[PDB]
Ligand SMILES: Nc1nc2c(ncn2[C@@H]2O[C@H](COP(=O)(O)OP(=O)(O)NP(=O)(O)O)[C@@H](O)[C@H]2O)c(=O)[nH]1
Ligand SMILES: Nc1nc2c(ncn2[C@@H]2O[C@H](COP(=O)(O)OP(=O)(O)NP(=O)(O)O)[C@@H](O)[C@H]2O)c(=O)[nH]1
Ligand SMILES: [Mg+2]
């Protein structure tokens with residue numbers, strides 16, 4: 001039987017494991033190992049219908065030849081596990097056990113892999129957990145459907161920038177863009193009168209939101225430039241709300257009869273738009289098309305980097321900004337102390353009596369501390385505590401180095 | 417005639433102006449100026465129905481004595497300006513021109529003020545813009561309604577942490593908690609079968625979601641502790657979806673007949689739950705009750721700080737993390753160079769011929785530069801560049817100080 005397979009597992013201690021046995025069983029089988037691969041992923045915030053969408057992609061993948069691939073209207077939606085409720089469902093990364101072999105309009109036979117991912121910003125996950133899942137799914141997929149609710153907000157762009165930057169760090173250097181197709185899929189688009197449901201309205205909507213212009217503030221420009229530089233092809237699809245039954249009914253199990261017809265109409269456009277043979281983007285790494293065996297080799301290698309400690313840790317705004325503020329303030333403070341001591345006992349300055357040098361040092365040290373205490377920082381004195389002690393500990397070291405210099409110039413005259 | 421008044425203006429260059437004349441005209445009037453004040457605010461992501469909600473608060477405020485204050489089912493919703501479309505409507509902060517005078521059950525007559533705010537994360541706003549509006553509405557309000565769509569995600573908690581932290585920085589030091597009542601208002605709650613609509617289901621949902629435990633990762637703990645430490649009273653209300661007409665219909669103008677009965681039923685509970693006489697939290701700053709007169713003074717004082725450059729700038733995850741990584745790497749790299757030069761030309765060391773010292777310095781500088789280059793940082797080499805040049809420029813300054821120490825020990829012997 002075909003089924004979902006857990007491939008990347010996120011542990012309770014926030015570490016990550018790759019099930020290589022399971023991965024090899026699927027992608028290294030003789031029928032597919034040497035086929036060029038198309039990898040489709042859906043990712044984004046938790047509880048927003050990723051698995052559900054992905055299960056409709058499955059119906060299409062199996063029954064694409066039929067005009068009614070969308071399914072019997074009384075049949076439940078199965079595959080990757082999905083359900084209602086406010087608690088996250090999908091964890092780590094899972095792939096469908098059956099790799100699809102599809103013929104492209106070029107006579108080419110390709111392997112199609114489907115990837116479902118753990119939602120970002122659930123309440124048991126560190127930012128590192130979420131970033132790793134998102135990054136890994138982006139580096140591996142050739143088509144990434146970035147799933148969003150109702151609108152494309154500035155915080156959505158910021159997250160994407162962060163998560164994709166985390167992906168870039170783990171990759172070999174290239175002048176080419178790191179990734180290929182990105183789709184901003186907007187669920188519950190509420191304004192068809194302004195931008196139509198689907199790809200055309202979506203495209204117009206996205207071009208307005210990702211626009212970079214001369215008078216746009218750099219912070220706004222930069223997050224946008226980052227996204228443009230990452231992906232070869234960027235598109236947007238606006239999907240209508242599927243109706244409150246889909247949203248609210250604890251008994252709903254996916255029967256098309258319970259889904260609003262305008263949603264079904266746009267869904268039938270969306271899936272082939274993603275996944276028809278003419279649309280299947282072959283995975284390229286470093287500008288080279290990759291086979292299923294090669295994809296397994298990049299997957300192992302990338303995971304290894306995220307399991308290690310070479311990468312910087314992803315951090316929240318408060319945490320990262322607090323660190324930045326403190327580090328910068330320690331540097332100014334120390335550097336102020338250091339310039340001033342140079343005027344007292346630099347190499348071109350005379351011997352100073354050690355009692356007087358200690359008095360000037362205490363003066364100068366204190367000025368640097370008061371200087372540091374006085375700079376406002378995220379998040380206040382509490383967070384600063386360990387940095388202030390570092391500042392003092394580091395100034396004392398400089399002072400010790402100055403003492404040695406001063407002592408090498410010592411003058412003593414015997415006198416009654 | 418009562419109406420909305422623009423009180424805080426955000427300019428196109430991202431600066432802030434207070435309309436004091438307008439503020440004084442409203443809050444310094446002889447009837448209200450000396451009355452203890454209750455300030456109600458709504459804040460959160462743009463396009464989520466903040467103003468719409470507030471206009472229902474206005475209906476309750478005018479008609480609280482009637483059981484049917486919610487209105488005639490054909491009456492359009494007016495007051496603060498609201499509409500559909502994906503582009504933000506409300507900018508800055510506006511207050512209702514009419515201050516409501518209400519008698520509390522203890523016989524006190526208090527003044528009630530309403531605040532509508534510019535939504536966060538729109539595509540024309542810097543993070544500082546958003547942070548400033550949210551912070552200011554929180555510092556001024558005694559009741560802050562934190563408006564969320566569908567769920568409370570880890571990113572929502574993070575935004576709230578940052579924004580409230582930005583507010584604390586502008587405030588006087590105190591052992592008391594900086595703020596009073598916070599309401600997590602969840603719009604379009606989809607799981608009444610799990611947690612009931614309203615305050616009781618919200619309270620249970622929020623206690624699960626804001627819970628701090630021993631085995632929870634510090635990052636999850638810290639965002640929670642911060643929120644507990646900021647607010648005196650924290651509550652949650654789960655609100656049903658108002659129906660797709662309200663969400664989707666460009667002609668909808670607020671008539672209750674077009675709004676789902678379950679939403680209306682719950683709306684009728686929510687507003688008095690927020691704003692009934694027994695519920696009206698009198699504004700306290702530093703543990704002291706504030707009059708309308710006093711509030712205007714704090715509003716002016718806080719604004720000055722946000723107009724200045726005393727505060728740290730709010731930054732995105734990538735911007736702050738990139739800076740932290742770079743600052744930290746420059747300090748290690750410089751510190752490595754510095755220790756090594758100490759073994760060569762500290763005060764306890766012999767004279768070294770300047771040609772040889774230069775050779776040692778170049779060796780050492782290069783080692784520190786590689787050390788810096790080898791550390792992976794967000795986001796890569798481009799961003800690291802201004803820092804690397806600073807690193808080289810700062811090492812050269814150190815070298816210049818060492819040259820002087822060394823020259824002070826010079827040995828020259830004349831010999832044929
Ligand atoms: N409002 C809305 N709800 C949807 C939509 N599609 C699916 N849902 C509902 O979303 C709920 C969760 O779906 P699911 O696919 O499990 O979401 P997920 O993104 O995979 N969740 P997780 O990140 O926890 O795996 C279900 O009750 C489903 O009916 C949509 O377009 N809009
Ligand atoms: N889904 C949903 N839509 C709602 C709800 N309440 C109001 N709306 C719709 O949301 C839209 C925006 O309402 P509005 O009050 O202007 O929102 P806002 O949060 O003040 N927006 P802004 O930040 O741009 O000023 C309107 O079309 C309104 O009908 C709700 O609970 N759920
Ligand atoms: Mg899922």
Ligand SMILES: [Mg+2]
Nearest residue numbers: 466467505506
């Ligand atoms: Mg508004």
